[PDB]
Design a protein around this ligand. Structure first.
Ligand SMILES: CSC[C@H]1O[C@@H](n2cnc3c(N)ncnc32)[C@H](O)[C@@H]1O
Ligand SMILES: CSC[C@H]1O[C@@H](n2cnc3c(N)ncnc32)[C@H](O)[C@@H]1O
Ligand SMILES: [Cl-]
Ligand SMILES: [Cl-]
Lengths: 231, 231
């Protein structure tokens, strides 16, 4: 068999299209408040789950995937807010690096985003990111590669957008990527974080998020499936 | 044998006294960027580790303790900032409930601290908290029981203190308790979060934190050991 693959979203809406697109029989397995969908696709075991929103939920679920299910790589798929003009609604990006943008130990003179015995930026798989870019090029679709900023707040203001761009040079904002990628690094598991834009993280981001959740989630899911087809 | 006990701190300084106080032989076992210290004490297996600071670190470590080591209860020991006049430097409290004070999905009209498919407050073990209070009473020391607010920022301002008190009626602030307790709840593992005050979470909190880390960490550790002696 091929290498077992964990596939993660944050919300049920992000994994519904994934389950449908793979089209195989899934066994549901409950663990730690999550439901894991276990199946076989192209001679690979795939484990699919949504974590629920935010850093704690996604850290927990990723750790479970690795420790309880023994996944050998993790692909994350979902929606995000754009911080750059060139990332429009529905556009895709993969995270070259991620940061926890809400971490603040500045009282001890640490840079924002930094925690002792850790680092500001978290790395992802160069191999998976390069695969993503090749697939995008062949499909003739755009694919940005940049920094994704993750925190436990839904960002919907110009001020916070300006901070994320100025402090971290982030291209997009969401609430799970950094934690998923962090856990994968700690366990030596290759990770790719893929996001489709559904809003511009500004004052109207809530309405845009609602309008485009279904389409953006499907866009990311379809692309994730195209990556698995090449693995 | 008795029930296996996980013992957690956030920083090395918080677990050093724990290891010394138990005084038994520990085997060091690395996993996921953490070092777990495994030993036997009063016919109980104890697993001791520091998570590193913050929600992601502590979520990861707690999940590892439960999934990889199969602990049957988790006791957390460490230092915190006071939000109430009656909690002075060195004073102890146990968390009756915890909240993630930096969670903000208000763009979707959710209450602060709330995430869909979750809850604002996380519960802890009534049994362990009651044990703590009995021990405190017998030792003739004060022990507060209240809400602990956890977030990924070191709090050092009157404005943020006022928010924590007004929004959550929190008694103390720290950066790991809510995540540890959250993971324990998801896995059905009893949890007690114990903290000793080392600062007042105000403009001078950084200096106070440094001055009292050693003493406050030891105060919490000694009390945690006294609980284990009754288990
Ligand atoms: C309902 S909370 C937003 C959910 O969508 C993602 N997301 C999309 N746009 C944004 C944004 N503007 N700010 C934060 N997270 C975002 C986050 O990862 C989370 O799972
Ligand atoms: C060095 S970051 C502070 C460490 O001590 C705890 N802590 C103590 N006082 C405070 C405070 N004022 N604000 C946040 N965390 C605190 C947090 O849980 C963390 O592990
Ligand atoms: Cl905002
Ligand atoms: Cl503050």
């Amino acid at each position: 068999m091929g290498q077992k693959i964990g596939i993660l979203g944050a919300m049920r809406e992000e994994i519904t299209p994934i389950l449908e697109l793979f089209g195989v029989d899934f066994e549901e397995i409950p663990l730690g408040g999550n439901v894991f969908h276990k199946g076989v696709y192209h001679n690979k075991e795939i484990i699919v789950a949504y974590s629920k929103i935010g850093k704690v939920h996604s850290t927990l679920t990723t750790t479970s995937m690795i420790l309880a299910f023994g996944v050998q790589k993790v692909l994350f798929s979902g929606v995000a807010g754009s911080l750059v003009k060139d990332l429009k609604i529905n556009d895709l990006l993969v995270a070259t690096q991620l940061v926890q943008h809400d971490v603040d130990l500045s009282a001890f003179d640490h840079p924002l985003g930094f925690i002792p015995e850790s680092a500001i930026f978290i790395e992802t798989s160069g191999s998976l990111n390069a695969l993503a870019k090749k697939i995008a090029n062949e499909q003739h679709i755009a694919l940005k590669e940049g920094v994704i900023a993750s925190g436990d707040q839904f960002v919907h203001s110009k001020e916070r957008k300006e901070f994320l761009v100025s402090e971290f040079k982030a291209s997009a904002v969401e609430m799970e990527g950094a934690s998923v990628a962090f856990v994968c690094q700690k366990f030596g598991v290759p990770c790719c974080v893929l996001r489709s834009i559904s809003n511009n993280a500004d004052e109207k981001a809530g309405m845009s998020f609602d309008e485009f959740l279904e389409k953006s989630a499907h866009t990311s899911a379809k692309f994730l499936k195209s990556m698995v087809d090449e693995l």
